[PDB]
């Protein structure tokens, strides 16, 4: 399958874990993968990670040739800055059909912990095999997007304060959301039956 990739930076706190559960390794059935994200943890609250994501590398160290326990030792001994290179299954492209119509709605949200409480996946890419609309794949319960109640997994992010996301990469779309201010109006596209 064609994969999307993304870089996630997590700041580790002196007396705590990341709330990130990792499965896999050369001695295991699967490759290194996010298998759980602890509720309210650093990893969950980043809004950049999802269960099922593959971890290709931590701090520029490729994980694939490590045994499971070696990957864990690596993660437990990282300093405050953890840099995960992540690969993920691309979001399916929703297409307008006879029974599916697209509509839009403006959603205003305020930040909390510098995030809007949703994960985006996809984005423009030179390799058209990897190129996708920017899809909101997860909405963290209790977070801003969840509280406001409009945005749903599968919805597309079209613009952020009138800045349109067409042609923008995943990294670019993330920066637009980061360099956003504490409030933002987002344009959301979604599926309607018939």
């Amino acid at each position: 399958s064609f994969k999307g990739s993304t870089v996630v930076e997590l700041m580790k706190k002196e007396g705590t874990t990341l709330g990130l559960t990792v499965s896999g390794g050369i001695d295991k059935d699967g490759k290194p993968r996010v298998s759980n994200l602890r509720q309210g943890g650093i990893a969950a609250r980043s809004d950049q990670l999802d269960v099922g994501d593959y971890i290709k590398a931590v701090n520029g160290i490729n994980l694939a040739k490590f045994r499971h326990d070696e990957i864990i030792s690596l993660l437990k001994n990282v300093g405050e800055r953890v840099v995960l290179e992540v690969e993920y299954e691309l979001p399916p492209v929703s297409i307008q059909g006879s029974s599916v119509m697209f509509r839009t709605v403006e959603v205003t949200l305020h930040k909390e912990g510098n995030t809007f409480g949703f994960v985006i996946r996809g984005g423009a890419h030179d390799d058209r095999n990897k190129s996708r609309p920017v899809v909101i794949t997860c909405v963290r319960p209790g977070g801003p997007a969840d509280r406001e109640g409009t945005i749903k997994p599968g919805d597309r992010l079209l613009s952020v304060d009138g800045i349109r996301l067409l042609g923008t990469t995943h990294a670019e779309a993330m920066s637009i959301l980061k360099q956003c201010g504490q409030e933002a109006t987002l344009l959301i596209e979604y599926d309607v039956s018939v």
Partner: peptide, 4 residues
């Protein structure tokens, strides 16, 4: 898997 193992939690970190």
């Amino acid at each position: 898997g193992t939690e970190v």
